[PDB]
Every structure is written in C-alpha cells, then in structure tokens.
Amino acid sequence: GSHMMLVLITYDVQTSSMGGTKRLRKVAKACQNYGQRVQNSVFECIVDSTQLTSLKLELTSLIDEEKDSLRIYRLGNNYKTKVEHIGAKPSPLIF
Amino acid sequence: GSHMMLVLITYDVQTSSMGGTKRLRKVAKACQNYGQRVQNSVFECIVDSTQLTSLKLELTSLIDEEKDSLRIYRLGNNYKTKVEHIGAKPSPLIF
C-alpha cells in the first residue's frame, strides 16, 4: 500500500551488562511485532505511519538514554533488494 | 554528483571479547575513510561505486565470519534528513 514504509532500527547497547541484555530482549520483542531481527541489534520493520509512531514511542521508553541509543532510518521506497549480508547469521551463562 | 551513494554499514560484533574489540577498531578506521561513526558499530558512508567496492572488500576481509556480520544498505537517494537519533552519542580496562 501507498501508506507503507521501510524502517531500519539500529540499537547501540552493550550486552555484556545485565541491564543491556534485558533492554535488548525488550527492544527485540517490540520490533518483532513489526518485522525481522537481521543482526543482534538491527531490526527491519515495514510499517504505516501510525505503527511507526507507536513503535518509536515504545522503543524510546525502553532504552537507557545515558548508556544506549537508537537510530531510526526511513528508507526511500525500494522494491528490489539493496542489502548485502556478510558473515554469520544472528542467534546459559557460564564461567 | 550523480555517481554518489548513501551507504549504511551495520557491524554485529561483541566487544566484550579481545578479538571483537580489535576488529571493531579496524572496521571503524576503514569506514572513517568514507564517512562518520554514528553509533559504536554503525557507519554512514557517502561513496561512489569504486569506493564502495574497495571499502566492502576491505571490510569483508577484516571480520571474523564465524562470529561477526556486516550488513551494507544502499539507501535510495535522499536530500533531507530521514534519521532520528534517540539517546546517547557514541564514545582503560579496569576490574
């Protein structure tokens, strides 16, 4: 539909930390409602304007703004793939 | 120029590790030749086709393909900003 948009969300979080691990799980769950997890902390979402706003509010509220950041890219409309994946696909604690 | 392209590079690396830290430093240095580091492991590059190929070869060779990945996005041409940054800006070992 003419109202749809490609949105790329890049989340800068350090998962060596407890809180970062928790926040990543919550951000991933929120983004999964609207798309796919293509790297550990990169999400490809396909949304209308209302969904983008709801998602963006949800994500803004989940992060630790002192420690983390999000970037939200609204890609120009695209109908043939313009992404290359190089390397591994994304996936208990142990001493 | 008509030959220019916006390219977003997203690098999935775990920097809790020694090798990941080393690889990130090398990837960042390579991408800095062509643009800006906007998150710890996200780079915005503005390149012609020859530069994109040279950069992409360099980056493919630097990563550990068992542990890491890159995604290379060729954004549609854009002349007014379509990115929102939310949260913190990117930046010795200690016990």
From Swiss-Prot, chains A, B:
Mg(2+) binds at D12. Its cofactor is Mg(2+); Mn(2+); Fe(2+); Ni(2+). Keywords: Antiviral defense, Endonuclease, Hydrolase, Magnesium, Metal-binding, Nuclease. Transmembrane segments: none annotated. Signal peptide: none annotated. GO terms for biological process: defense response to virus; maintenance of CRISPR repeat elements. InterPro entries: CRISPR_associated_Cas2 (IPR021127), Virulence_VapD/CRISPR_Cas2 (IPR019199). Binds 1 Mg(2+) per homodimer, shared between the Asp-12 pair; divalent cations support activity in decreasing order, Mg(2+) >> Mn(2+) > Fe(2+) > Ni(2+) > Ca(2+). Inhibited by EDTA and Zn(2+). Activated by high concentrations of monovalent cation with a preference for K(+) over Na(+). Optimum pH is 7-10. It comes from the Bacteria. It is an enzyme of class 3 (hydrolase). Its EC number is 3.1.-.-. It holds the Pfam family CRISPR_Cas2. The keyword Hydrolase applies. GO terms for molecular function: DNA endonuclease activity; magnesium ion binding; protein homodimerization activity; RNA endonuclease activity. HAMAP family: Cas2. Belongs to the CRISPR-associated endoribonuclease Cas2 protein family. CRISPR (clustered regularly interspaced short palindromic repeat), is an adaptive immune system that provides protection against mobile genetic elements (viruses, transposable elements and conjugative plasmids). CRISPR clusters contain sequences complementary to antecedent mobile elements and target invading nucleic acids. CRISPR clusters are transcribed and processed into CRISPR RNA (crRNA). Involved in the integration of spacer DNA into the CRISPR cassette. Functions as a dsDNA-specific endonuclease, acting on circular and linear DNA; has no activity on ssRNA or ssDNA. Homodimer, forms a heterotetramer with a Cas1 homodimer. This is CRISPR-associated endonuclease Cas2.
